[PDB]
Amino acid sequence: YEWLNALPKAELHLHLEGTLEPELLFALAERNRIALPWNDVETLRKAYAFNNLQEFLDLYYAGADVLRTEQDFYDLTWAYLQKCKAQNVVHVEPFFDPQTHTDRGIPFEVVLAGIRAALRDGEKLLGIRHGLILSFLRHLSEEQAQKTLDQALPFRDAFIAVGLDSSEVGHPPSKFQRVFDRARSEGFLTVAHAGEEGPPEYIWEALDLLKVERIDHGVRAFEDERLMRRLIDEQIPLTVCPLSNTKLCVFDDMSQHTILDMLERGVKVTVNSDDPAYFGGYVTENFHALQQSLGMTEEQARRLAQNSLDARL
Ligand SMILES: Clc1ncnc2[nH]cnc12
Ligand SMILES: [Zn+2]
């Protein structure tokens, strides 16, 4: 572990809202004077049992209530930048979900201020380079996304890419092709969750329609050889999330996980923690689960760590 923790890494698939620890959640609630459904930290922590993506999501959004002030968004981001320091993540390209917050009345500018501040502290004090990614909520309309992109236009230099998360199945990338088109046009790079719960088809759609620069998750590509051959050939990065997939039941066990398999095949896979407060591990704890349940070698360790550097935007 300490050896794994010492490796230099990049984290390219990480949702800031999913770094919200039960302890922080209770504290922000107290500061904001909010009566929580949950009786204590322990009761909330026990609630992190999932049978799929949605059950997690419903919870994950409920937690966003305590996020209300610039200082809230600072605290959340800075706490994660500190974990990055502990685990020697020297670089971050994190997600946030503007709509989760703006739809609750919080001004877009407040959300951004607190995160940006934290990120500045991250680089000047911690030596952590960052590339903020703005994610669209895919269960919601393209209209709503467009409205969000309009909010982001004045801020466009704060974001290296637009992303796409939330309930994957039944909301294909094609749903958002116009806004993504428009985003690239306004000079955004792009990325997307594809093939977490949804079919490989969604991953071709991400590559070709949404013109992503990397596939987030992407594990279900394993069912599609033609796709595999493309991944391997184009060296398109995949931001894979071990704990997330186990917690969400994408795999029934860590021993069933295919990330090493892909790696030995030449796929440019990376190790990321995704929603660390909900999956019980930051990036180092992900590498470690690989070692424990799949006898990952120090060899493959260094290799996955290096891909995360290579795949930076
Ligand atoms: Cl991994 C993932 N998939 C869909 N929605 C999400 N929100 C935070 N992480 C997410
Ligand atoms: Zn994710």
Curated annotation (Swiss-Prot):
Zn(2+) binds at H13, H15, H193, D274. The record marks H217 as: Important for catalytic activity. Substrate binds at D275. Signal peptide: none annotated. The active site is at E196. GO terms for biological process: adenine catabolic process; hypoxanthine salvage; nucleotide metabolic process. Its cofactor is Zn(2+). GO terms for molecular function: adenine deaminase activity; zinc ion binding. It comes from the Bacteria. Its EC number is 3.5.4.2. It is an enzyme of class 3 (hydrolase). CDD domains: ADA. Binds 1 zinc ion per subunit. Keywords: Hydrolase, Metal-binding, Nucleotide metabolism, Zinc. Belongs to the metallo-dependent hydrolases superfamily. Adenosine and AMP deaminases family. Adenine deaminase type 2 subfamily. Catalyzes the hydrolytic deamination of adenine to hypoxanthine. Plays an important role in the purine salvage pathway and in nitrogen catabolism. This is Adenine deaminase.
